[PDB]
JSON list of C-alpha atoms in Angstrom, two decimals:
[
{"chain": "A", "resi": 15, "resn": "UNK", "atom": "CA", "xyz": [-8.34, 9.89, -0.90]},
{"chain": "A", "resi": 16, "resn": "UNK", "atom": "CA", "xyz": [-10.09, 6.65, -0.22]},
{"chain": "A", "resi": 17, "resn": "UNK", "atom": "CA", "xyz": [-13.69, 7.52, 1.39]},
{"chain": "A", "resi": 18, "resn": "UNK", "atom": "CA", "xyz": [-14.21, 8.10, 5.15]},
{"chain": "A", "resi": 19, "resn": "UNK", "atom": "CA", "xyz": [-16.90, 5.12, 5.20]},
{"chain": "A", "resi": 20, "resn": "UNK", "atom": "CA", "xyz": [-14.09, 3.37, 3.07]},
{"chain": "A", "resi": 21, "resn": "UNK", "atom": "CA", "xyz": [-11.47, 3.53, 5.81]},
{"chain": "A", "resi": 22, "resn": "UNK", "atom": "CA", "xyz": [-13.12, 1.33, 8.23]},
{"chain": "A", "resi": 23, "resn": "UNK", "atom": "CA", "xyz": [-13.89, -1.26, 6.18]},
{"chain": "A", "resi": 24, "resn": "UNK", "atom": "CA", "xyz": [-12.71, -4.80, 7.54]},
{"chain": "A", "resi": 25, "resn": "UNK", "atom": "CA", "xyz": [-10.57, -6.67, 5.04]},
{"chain": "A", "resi": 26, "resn": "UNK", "atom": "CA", "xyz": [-8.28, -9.77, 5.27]},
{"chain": "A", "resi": 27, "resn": "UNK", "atom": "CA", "xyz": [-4.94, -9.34, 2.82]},
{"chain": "A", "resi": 28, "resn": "UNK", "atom": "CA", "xyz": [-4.05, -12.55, 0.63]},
{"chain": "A", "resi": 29, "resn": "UNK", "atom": "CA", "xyz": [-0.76, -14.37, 1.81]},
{"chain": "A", "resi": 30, "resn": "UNK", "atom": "CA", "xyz": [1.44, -12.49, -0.11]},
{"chain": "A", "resi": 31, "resn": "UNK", "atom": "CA", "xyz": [0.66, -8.62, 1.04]},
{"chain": "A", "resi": 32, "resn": "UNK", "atom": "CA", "xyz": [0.14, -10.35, 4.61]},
{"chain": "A", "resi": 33, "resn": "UNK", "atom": "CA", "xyz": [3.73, -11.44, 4.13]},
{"chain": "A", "resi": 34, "resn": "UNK", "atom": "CA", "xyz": [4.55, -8.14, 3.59]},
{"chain": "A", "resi": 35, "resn": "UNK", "atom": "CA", "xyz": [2.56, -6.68, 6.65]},
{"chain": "A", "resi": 36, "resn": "UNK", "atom": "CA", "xyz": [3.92, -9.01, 9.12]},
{"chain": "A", "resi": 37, "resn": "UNK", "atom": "CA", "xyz": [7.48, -7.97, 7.44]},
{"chain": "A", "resi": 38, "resn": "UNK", "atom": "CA", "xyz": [6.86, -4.52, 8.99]},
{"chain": "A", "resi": 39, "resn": "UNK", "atom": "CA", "xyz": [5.24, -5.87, 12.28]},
{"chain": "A", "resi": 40, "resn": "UNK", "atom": "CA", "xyz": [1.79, -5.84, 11.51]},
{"chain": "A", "resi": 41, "resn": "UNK", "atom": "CA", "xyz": [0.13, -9.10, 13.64]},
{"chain": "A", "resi": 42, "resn": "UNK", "atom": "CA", "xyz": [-3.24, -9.64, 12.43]},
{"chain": "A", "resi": 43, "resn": "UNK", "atom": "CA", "xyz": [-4.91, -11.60, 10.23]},
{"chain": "A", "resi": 44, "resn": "UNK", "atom": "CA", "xyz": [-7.71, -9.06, 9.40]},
{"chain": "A", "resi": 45, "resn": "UNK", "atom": "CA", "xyz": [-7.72, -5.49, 9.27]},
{"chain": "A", "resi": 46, "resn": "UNK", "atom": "CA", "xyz": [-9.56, -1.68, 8.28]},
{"chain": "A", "resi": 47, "resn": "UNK", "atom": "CA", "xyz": [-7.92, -0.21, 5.04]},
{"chain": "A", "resi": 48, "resn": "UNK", "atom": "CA", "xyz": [-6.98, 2.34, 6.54]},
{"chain": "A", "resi": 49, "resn": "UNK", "atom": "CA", "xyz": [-4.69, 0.35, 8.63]},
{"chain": "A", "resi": 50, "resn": "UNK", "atom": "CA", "xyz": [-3.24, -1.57, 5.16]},
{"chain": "A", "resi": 51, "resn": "UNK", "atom": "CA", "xyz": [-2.72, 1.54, 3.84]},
{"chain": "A", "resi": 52, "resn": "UNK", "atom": "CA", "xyz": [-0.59, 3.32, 6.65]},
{"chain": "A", "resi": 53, "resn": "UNK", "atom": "CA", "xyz": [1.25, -0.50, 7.13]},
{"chain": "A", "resi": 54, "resn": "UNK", "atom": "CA", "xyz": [2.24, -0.44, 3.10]},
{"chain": "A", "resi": 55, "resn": "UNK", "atom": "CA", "xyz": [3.45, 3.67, 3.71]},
{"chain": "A", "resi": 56, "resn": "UNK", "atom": "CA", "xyz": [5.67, 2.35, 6.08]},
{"chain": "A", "resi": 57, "resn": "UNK", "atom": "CA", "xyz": [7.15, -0.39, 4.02]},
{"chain": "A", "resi": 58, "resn": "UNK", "atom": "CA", "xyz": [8.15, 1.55, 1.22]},
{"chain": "A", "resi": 59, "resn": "UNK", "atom": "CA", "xyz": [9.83, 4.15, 3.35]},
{"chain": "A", "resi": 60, "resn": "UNK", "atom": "CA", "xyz": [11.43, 1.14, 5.84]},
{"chain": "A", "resi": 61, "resn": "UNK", "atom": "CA", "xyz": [12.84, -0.31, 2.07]},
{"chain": "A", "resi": 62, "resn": "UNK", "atom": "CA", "xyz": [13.29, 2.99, 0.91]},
{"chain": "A", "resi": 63, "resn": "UNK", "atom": "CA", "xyz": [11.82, 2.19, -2.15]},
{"chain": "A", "resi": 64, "resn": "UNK", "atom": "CA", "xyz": [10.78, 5.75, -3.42]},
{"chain": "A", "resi": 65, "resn": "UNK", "atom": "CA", "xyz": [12.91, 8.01, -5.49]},
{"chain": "A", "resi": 66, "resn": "UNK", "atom": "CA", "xyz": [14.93, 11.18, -3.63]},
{"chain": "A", "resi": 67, "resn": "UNK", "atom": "CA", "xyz": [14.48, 13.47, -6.06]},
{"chain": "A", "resi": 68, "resn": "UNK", "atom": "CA", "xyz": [11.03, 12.92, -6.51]},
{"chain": "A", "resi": 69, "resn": "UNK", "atom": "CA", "xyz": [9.48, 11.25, -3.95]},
{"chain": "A", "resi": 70, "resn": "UNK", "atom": "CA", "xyz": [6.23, 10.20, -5.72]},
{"chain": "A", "resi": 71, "resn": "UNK", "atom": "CA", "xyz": [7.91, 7.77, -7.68]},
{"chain": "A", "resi": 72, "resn": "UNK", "atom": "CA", "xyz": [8.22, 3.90, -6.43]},
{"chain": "A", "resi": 73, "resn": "UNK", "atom": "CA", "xyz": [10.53, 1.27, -8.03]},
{"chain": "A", "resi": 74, "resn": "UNK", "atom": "CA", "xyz": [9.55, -2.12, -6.83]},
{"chain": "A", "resi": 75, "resn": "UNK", "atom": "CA", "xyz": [10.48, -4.51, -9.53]},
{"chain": "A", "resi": 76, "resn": "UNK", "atom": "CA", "xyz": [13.15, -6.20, -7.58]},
{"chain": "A", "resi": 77, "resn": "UNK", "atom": "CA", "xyz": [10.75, -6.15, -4.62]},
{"chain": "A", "resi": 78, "resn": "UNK", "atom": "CA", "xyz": [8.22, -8.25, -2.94]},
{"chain": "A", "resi": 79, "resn": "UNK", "atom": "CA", "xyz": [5.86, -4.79, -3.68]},
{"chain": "A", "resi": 80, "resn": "UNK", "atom": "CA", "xyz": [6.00, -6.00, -7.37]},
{"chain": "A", "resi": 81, "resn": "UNK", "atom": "CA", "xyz": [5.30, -9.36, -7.15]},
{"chain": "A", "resi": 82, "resn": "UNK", "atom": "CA", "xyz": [2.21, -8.73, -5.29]},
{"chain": "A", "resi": 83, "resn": "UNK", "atom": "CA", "xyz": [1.33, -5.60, -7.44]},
{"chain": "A", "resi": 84, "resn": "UNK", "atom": "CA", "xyz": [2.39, -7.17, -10.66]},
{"chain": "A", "resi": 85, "resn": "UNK", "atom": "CA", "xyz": [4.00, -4.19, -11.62]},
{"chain": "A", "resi": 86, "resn": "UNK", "atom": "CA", "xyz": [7.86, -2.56, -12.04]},
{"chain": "A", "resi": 87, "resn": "UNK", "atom": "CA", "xyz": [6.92, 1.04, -10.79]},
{"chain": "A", "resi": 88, "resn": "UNK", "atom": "CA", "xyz": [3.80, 3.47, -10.31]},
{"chain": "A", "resi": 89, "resn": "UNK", "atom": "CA", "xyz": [3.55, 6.43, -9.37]},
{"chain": "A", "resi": 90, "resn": "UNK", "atom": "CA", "xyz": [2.08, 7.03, -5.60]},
{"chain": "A", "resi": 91, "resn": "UNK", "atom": "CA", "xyz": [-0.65, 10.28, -7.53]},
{"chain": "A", "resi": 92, "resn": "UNK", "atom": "CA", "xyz": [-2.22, 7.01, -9.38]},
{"chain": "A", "resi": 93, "resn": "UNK", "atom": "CA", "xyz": [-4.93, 6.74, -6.56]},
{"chain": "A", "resi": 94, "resn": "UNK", "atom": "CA", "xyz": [-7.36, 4.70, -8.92]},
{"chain": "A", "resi": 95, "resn": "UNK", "atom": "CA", "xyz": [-4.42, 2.67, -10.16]},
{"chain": "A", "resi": 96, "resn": "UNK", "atom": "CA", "xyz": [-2.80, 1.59, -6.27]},
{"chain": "A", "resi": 97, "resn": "UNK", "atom": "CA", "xyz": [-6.51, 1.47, -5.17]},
{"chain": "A", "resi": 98, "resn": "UNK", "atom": "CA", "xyz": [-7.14, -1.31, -7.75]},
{"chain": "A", "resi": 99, "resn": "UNK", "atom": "CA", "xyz": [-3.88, -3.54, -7.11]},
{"chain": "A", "resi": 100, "resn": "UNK", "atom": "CA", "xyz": [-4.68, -2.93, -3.51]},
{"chain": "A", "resi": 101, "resn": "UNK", "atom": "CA", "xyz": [-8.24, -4.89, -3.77]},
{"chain": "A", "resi": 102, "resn": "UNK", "atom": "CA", "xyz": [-6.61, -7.33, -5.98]},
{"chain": "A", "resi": 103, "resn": "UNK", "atom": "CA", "xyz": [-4.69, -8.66, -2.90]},
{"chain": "A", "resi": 104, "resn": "UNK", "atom": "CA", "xyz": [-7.28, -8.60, -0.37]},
{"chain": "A", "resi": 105, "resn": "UNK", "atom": "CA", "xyz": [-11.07, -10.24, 0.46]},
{"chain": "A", "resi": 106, "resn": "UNK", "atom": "CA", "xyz": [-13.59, -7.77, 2.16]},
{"chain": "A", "resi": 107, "resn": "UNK", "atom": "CA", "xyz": [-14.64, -9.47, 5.06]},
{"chain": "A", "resi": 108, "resn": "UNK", "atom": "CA", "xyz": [-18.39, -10.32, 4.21]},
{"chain": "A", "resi": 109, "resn": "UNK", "atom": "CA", "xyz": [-18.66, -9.79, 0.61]},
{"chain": "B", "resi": 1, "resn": "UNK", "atom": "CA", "xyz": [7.20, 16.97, -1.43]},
{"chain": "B", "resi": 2, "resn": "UNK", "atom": "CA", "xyz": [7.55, 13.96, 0.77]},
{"chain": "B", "resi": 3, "resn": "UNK", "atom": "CA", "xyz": [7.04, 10.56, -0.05]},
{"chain": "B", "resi": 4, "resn": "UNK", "atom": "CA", "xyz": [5.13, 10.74, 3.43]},
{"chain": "B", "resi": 5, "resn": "UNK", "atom": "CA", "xyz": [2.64, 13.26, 2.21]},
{"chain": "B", "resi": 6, "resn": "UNK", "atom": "CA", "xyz": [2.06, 11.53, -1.00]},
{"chain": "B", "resi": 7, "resn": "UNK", "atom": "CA", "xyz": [1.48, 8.96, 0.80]},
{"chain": "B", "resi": 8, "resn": "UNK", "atom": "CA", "xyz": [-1.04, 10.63, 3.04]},
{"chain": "B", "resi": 9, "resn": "UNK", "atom": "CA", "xyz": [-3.00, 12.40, 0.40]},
{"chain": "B", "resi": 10, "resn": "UNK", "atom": "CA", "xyz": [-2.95, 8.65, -1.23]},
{"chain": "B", "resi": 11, "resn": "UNK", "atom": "CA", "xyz": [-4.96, 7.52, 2.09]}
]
């Protein structure tokens, strides 16, 4: 659960996850996590990236997802771990 | 479970 505070904050995604925003429709340049975090939900699910059976798991290695991650799957009950590759591909407006 | 919910608990 990323904070409440958290949520709001104003961030600008590197070219790459932008690619993959505007893949999905997003048509910003800047944007609250909260709003890169329901836009990258809806990628995995429009790709259909995460595993039937159990749904947790995402394979991305033959994905834009892992190039920009710069992994070949996680597991979406990593928090810390997507949190982290998350920041990785953004600047927080500001700091 | 859902992908969705993990998903949502994630965020």
């Amino acid at each position: 659960q990323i904070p409440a505070s958290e949520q709001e904050t104003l961030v600008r995604p590197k070219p790459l996850l932008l690619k993959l925003l505007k893949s999905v429709g997003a048509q910003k340049d800047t944007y609250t996590m909260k709003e890169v975090l329901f836009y990258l939900g809806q990628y995995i699910a429009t790709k259909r990236l995460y595993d039937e059976k159990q749904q947790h798991i995402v394979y991305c290695s033959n994905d834009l997802l892992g190039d920009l991650f710069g992994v070949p799957s996680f597991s979406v009950k990593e928090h810390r771990k997507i949190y982290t590759m998350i920041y990785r591909n953004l600047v927080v407006v500001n700091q | 479970t859902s992908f969705x919910e993990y998903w949502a608990l994630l965020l």
